[PDB]
Swiss-Prot record, chains A, F:
Subunit: Interacts with host TFRC.
Cystines in this chain: 454-458
Domain statement: The N-terminus of VP1 is sequestered within the mature capsid. It contains a phospholipase A2-like region and nuclear localization signals that might be exposed by capsid modifications during virus entry.
Cellular compartment(s): Virion; Host nucleus
Full-length numbering of the shown residues: 180 to 727 of 727
Its job: Capsid protein self-assembles to form an icosahedral capsid with a T=1 symmetry, about 22 nm in diameter, and consisting of 60 copies of two size variants of the capsid proteins, VP1 and VP2, which differ by the presence of an N-terminal extension in the minor protein VP1. The capsid encapsulates the genomic ssDNA. Capsid proteins are responsible for the attachment to host cell receptor TFRC. This attachment induces virion internalization predominantly through clathrin-endocytosis.
Name of the protein in its database record: Capsid protein VP1
Residues the record lists as binding Mg(2+): 144
Keywords: Capsid protein, Clathrin-mediated endocytosis of virus by host, Cytoplasmic inwards viral transport, Disulfide bond, Host nucleus, Host-virus interaction, Magnesium, Metal-binding, Microtubular inwards viral transport, T=1 icosahedral capsid protein, Viral attachment to host adhesion receptor, Viral attachment to host cell, Viral attachment to host entry receptor, Viral penetration into host cytoplasm, Viral penetration into host nucleus, Viral penetration via permeabilization of host membrane, Virion, Virus endocytosis by host, Virus entry into host cell
GO MF term set: metal ion binding; structural molecule activity
A GO CC term assigned to this protein in UniProt: T=1 icosahedral viral capsid
Keyword Disulfide bond on entry: yes
UniProtKB/Swiss-Prot annotation, chain E:
Stated role: Capsid protein self-assembles to form an icosahedral capsid with a T=1 symmetry, about 22 nm in diameter, and consisting of 60 copies of two size variants of the capsid proteins, VP1 and VP2, which differ by the presence of an N-terminal extension in the minor protein VP1. The capsid encapsulates the genomic ssDNA. Capsid proteins are responsible for the attachment to host cell receptor TFRC. This attachment induces virion internalization predominantly through clathrin-endocytosis.
Subunit structure: Interacts with host TFRC.
Cell compartment(s), UniProt: Virion; Host nucleus
Covered range of the whole protein: 230 to 279 of 727
Protein name: Capsid protein VP1
Highest taxon of the lineage: Viruses
Domain remarks: The N-terminus of VP1 is sequestered within the mature capsid. It contains a phospholipase A2-like region and nuclear localization signals that might be exposed by capsid modifications during virus entry.
Family, as annotated: Belongs to the parvoviridae capsid protein family.
Other known facts: The capsids of autonomous parvoviruses expose a proportion of VP2 N-terminus and part of that sequence can be cleaved of to form VP3.
């Protein structure tokens, strides 16, 4: 009612150990959401044309032309790790569990408030805030998942990551079909490559409105809203990484000579001529059995074209890859393809007290060794005469198409019926948790943006909006713009995510890699004297697992 | 390709795709392996080029054998030396049963 | 039926180069021991196994 | 699988045999740049060492229950059932060129 | 390294690390352990699936 | 029987999760024990007199004079962490449990073997090893705990720490009463201080024999032996450390001024005159309320005399302390009293392949901040006039007794009815697990050598011995020495220790300190090319706990 | 546990002592003297006082 709270704040995550090493994690998240009336009360169909930028030859990848529908509604998105767990909780999961199961999701809106800004344009022009007791907040839960799915995490537009900092929802918008043509070129490409925005295929047109599709709820202060419980359908997420390469599968060669003394140079030695060894290979015309040569059961990882833009009906797009590299060879310097990069703000990790508008960012280098060093690759003529002769080898060094900065690895693809790979690991806190599968006949084996894809059913999106607070003057037949009383609303959002985890078991003599605070990272987990806060990202499949 | 005269586009070529149909590997008598352990990988390989039979959920475990240490009268665990043993060896009969 | 894959392709990851495997080789009308190709396995062994 | 090294039990029932020394791969990091006959210089060829997070040292003693058998003893694994799709004993001969 | 030290010999790579254990492995997974030429003929000429 | 094994090897530690976050750890340990016949078949009463060494003034602490009974039996001791867990298991306990409960213990002897060395004194003098099928191993379990308790871990004489390395038991010996007088002196002490070994008080004499007190079991190959299950009685062991000092207890002062800017020098400030503040103190004659002055509820830790040797009936002995220091001030360099030091061999951590007989050692610096910086201490006259005047202060700097290297802190003691301390933390792998309480009217509040003291009941000690393998010639009335056939025995020992642990829960925003492998310690957890092994020690109460 | 004596009297006699056989600064065992390698009977760790 008016003087009665309709809800409870809860940002406690509970861990409840079951039988046989199964835990049931239930993450409670609560926020104060602030929401403003819409720019307009209309659906807008807008095109973005940065033709001018692509107009420079060699800049095609800078393409941003698209059409979208702008709606008067806001999206409440809470699908990002940082919304549900803190550095503390993450350590617990990641250091002690071995697999994660996303079970359910629930969210509710309570303690709604609507105020109206009245400006007493005085000397020092003043403004009074008053409560509009009979005003309504509009809530719409698209549970039949009618509207197109728009995960706010790919834009760092989720609820914020700190329970003691109010937040806001994002203006909901969705892609509208368009046709565009852009021919690639390079620095000094004579002429002006076609760069055309053709418009919309009429048979690809779908204009959606919330009002016509979802039931809308008006909540006044006294009201409250609650989604019920949604159960997901998803394969479990592993919290361990693999490290074995094709090169480390199965029985190693028996060493006929073993070091007699300790010493970084006291190697053991297979004792047999590479052309006189027993074993299996798939090199029917050779007697050489080496570790690069001996037969392995399948292939771990695959090679895919790099910095490959493909083009369809709407402009060029980057070809995605399931895993990047990093390790022995790649660090920030040994920079490659396949590793994701996250850009974000003060609400999701960028230091709170930091002044300046450059996003905060990071490149994620996983821990499962399933990628490639293209630099180590080589194709070689089937005769296999060995110190191979410059024209019986194709090295990542020889140029293709006569371009000196392109080699066969950039167009290379070794994916096939023997490829073995793993799904993507969780990215705390900026990563998305779940994703909607494509309603495509044949589906993708994975999604590079979320470890959890719900197939048959996903929770629907939640839309919110201040209903129109009209003034005394209102003429629906005027070609003008509806005049409204400046209204805004504050409401509390409470969400509940439940997971099921399994506890890890030691299996080696040696200890495992664990997340731990230390003298160098310590200050990243506590506030500043100013109260500045930051949320440094962390890794998740720290412990090893044997692949075979 | 690449101006190498002993390399052509077939060496870098790949026509695997959603319409590919292939068969698993045939048995190689007598040197071929019978069964193989699947990879504990999220996505698995459609086949193994070394065994026609891959057991997924469960495989027989491996069997390890060893002569236990046959020490002599002299034995000092705190010596940085090498344990001295009585030259022992064992002969045993192994009997296995595979059903098809 | 079948597919084309890179031949005498060594790939490299964290631990050295390794040969790219293929699901089937050739042989017949064109390959015998002489029409030697990729995909066909080769077995080396001792007195205890043949 | 000892068969990729031709290290299985032997193939004749009237010939005594032997087991193989068990060994397993331990993680290492190595870099080798390809080259060819007459590649000026010396391509990087480095053995970097071990990623600590990829380290797994296993011992039999700490992981499996060990049985000591004396002459009078015996040991038997029980029956293990496999899970595997059947193996075809026939070959196909039709090419895209011979369909329909 | 010495062998790969020759340009054009990368495929001759054998560098690896391994754990050497005091135990022996009893492996019987190879066709030849269970069937003889005689039995193989029977399977192979008269069965259609295994 | 002869060709029948009587036991099973098992060195697997099982972790079985129960309900409500309780795990039941059951540690299995198995070893091959090698045992030789006794030097003699007699009990010997021996005195150790190093008078010559103490004969140098200023060397009293080098005293080793004692009497002991030397017995023909060996002790099988498995009470040291390293016998039951490996680096791998320790990580699991220590990073994820919050308290440990020692529940029970069981051990058994199987697969006994007795051989006799026969030397064919040839050119190259040879020796044949043969099985003595009817020979017996003698086993005695002192379950009524009759014999005096002698924990082999204070001498690094426990079973060894690696399951694939045979071991040996220790020759059992126990202290026999003696009377000795030693007067301290120093470099240049004129004369020769009394240094006398008086002998034995007849009323303090207790000669014990195994034969007369415990039932002895003869086991032949075909036999086996098993202790049954013993349940301990012990308070739980905490796996967390405390960090709060008297200085960090309760409500901090309210700051009237807070930093406006971030900055390592942008402090906040109490805004009130130290002599104008409200609050409580125990300084009845002062108006100054400071953090060193304000009242705390009790005292965490205490001050005790350092490098204090006390003397009773049998020589001088070092005064023990419940906790040392280390941290801000002590590292290896800021070396102090209270921290234990462990010396050991190849069987318990010293690198296996290392040549050389110097023990391997380490000083354990715990993590609970409950010790003292004596250097920060000061006594000051009750008038409390403040910039205190050299003669109203006693500083760790002024000399006592006119000795310039002695100050009041070395003789200081602040233990009293407000002292709060914690029991000793576990030392993996060289530390003892359990200890026998003193059969004293009043008992010690703790034991500085084991976190677990069993009061009412402890498992009894296990004694082993090759029974006499006589030759054809044997004359009991000869004053000579019995001649025996050179016999030795090898048997398998299997022990089972069960613990009960509770799983930890995160309670802070920030992560915890966890044990983890890394590029610097990695090689301490795997064998050498030579097969060298080592077992580096680890810490155990890594996570913090609030004291108040 | 008393120290293991590496040398035992061979003859009876009030002066025929046995001897630990190890350098006080080369012995194994526990102490609470973190800055010393000397393990003696006055020095070695006892459980309480």
């Amino acid at each position: 009612g008016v003087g009665i709270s309709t809800g409870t704040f809860n940002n406690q995550t509970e861990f409840k150990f079951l039988e046989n090493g199964w835990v049931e994690i239930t993450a409670n998240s609560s926020r104060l959401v602030h929401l403003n009336m819409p720019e307009s009360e209309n659906y807008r169909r807008v095109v973005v044309n940065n033709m001018d930028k692509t107009a420079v030859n060699g800049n095609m990848a800078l393409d941003d032309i698209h059409a979208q529908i702008v709606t008067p509604w806001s999206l409440v998105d809470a699908n990002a790790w940082g919304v549900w767990f803190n550095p503390g909780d993450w350590q617990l999961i990641v250091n002690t569990m071995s697999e994660l199961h996303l079970v359910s999701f629930e969210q509710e809106i309570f303690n709604v408030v609507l105020k109206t800004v009245s400006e007493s344009a005085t000397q020092p022009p003043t403004k009074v805030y008053n409560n509009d007791l009979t005003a309504s907040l509009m809530v719409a839960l698209d549970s039949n998942n009618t509207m197109p799915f728009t995960p706010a995490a790919m834009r760092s537009e989720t609820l914020g990551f700190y329970p003691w900092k109010p937040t806001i929802p994002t203006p909901w918008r969705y892609y509208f079909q368009w046709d565009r043509t852009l021919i690639p070129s390079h620095t000094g490409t004579s002429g002006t490559p076609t760069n055309i925005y053709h418009g919309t295929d009429p048979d690809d047109v779908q204009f959606y409105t919330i009002e016509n599709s979802v039931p809308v709820h008006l909540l006044r202060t006294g009201d409250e809203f609650a989604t019920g419980t949604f159960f997901f359908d998803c394969k479990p997420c592993r919290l361990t990484h693999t490290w074995q390469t094709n090169r480390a599968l199965g029985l190693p060669p028996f060493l006929n000579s073993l070091p007699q003394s300790e010493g970084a140079t006291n190697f053991g030695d297979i004792g047999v001529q590479q052309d006189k060894r027993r074993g299996v290979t798939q090199m029917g015309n050779t007697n050489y059995i080496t570790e690069a040569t001996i037969m392995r059961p399948a292939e771990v990882g695959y090679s895919a074209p790099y910095y490959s833009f493909e083009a369809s009906t709407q402009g060029p797009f980057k070809t995605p890859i399931a895993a990047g590299r990093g390790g022995a060879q790649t660090d920030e310097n040994q920079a490659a393809d396949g590793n994701p990069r996250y850009a974000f703000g003060r609400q999701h990790g960028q230091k709170t007290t930091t002044t300046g508008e450059t996003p905060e960012r990071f490149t994620y280098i996983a821990h499962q060794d399933t990628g490639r060093y293209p630099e180590g690759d080589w194709i070689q003529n089937i005769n296999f005469n060995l110190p191979v002769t410059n024209d019986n080898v194709l090295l990542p060094t020889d140029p293709i198409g006569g371009k000196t900065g392109i080699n066969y690895t950039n167009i290379f693809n070794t994916y096939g019926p023997l490829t073995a790979l793993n799904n993507v690991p969780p990215v705390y806190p900026n990563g998305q948790i779940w994703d909607k599968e494509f309603d495509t006949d044949l589906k993708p084996r994975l999604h590079v943006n979320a470890p959890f894809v719900c197939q048959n059913n996903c929770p629907g999106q939640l839309f919110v909006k201040v209903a129109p607070n009209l003034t005394n003057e209102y003429d629906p037949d005027a070609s003008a713009n509806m005049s409204r009383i400046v209204t805004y609303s504050d409401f509390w959002w409470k969400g509940k995510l439940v997971f099921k985890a399994k506890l890890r078991a030691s299996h080696t003599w040696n200890p495992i890699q664990q997340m731990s605070i230390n003298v160098d990272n310590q200050f990243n987990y506590v506030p500043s004297n100013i109260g500045g806060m930051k949320i440094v990202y962390e890794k998740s499949q720290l412990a090893p697992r044997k692949l075979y």
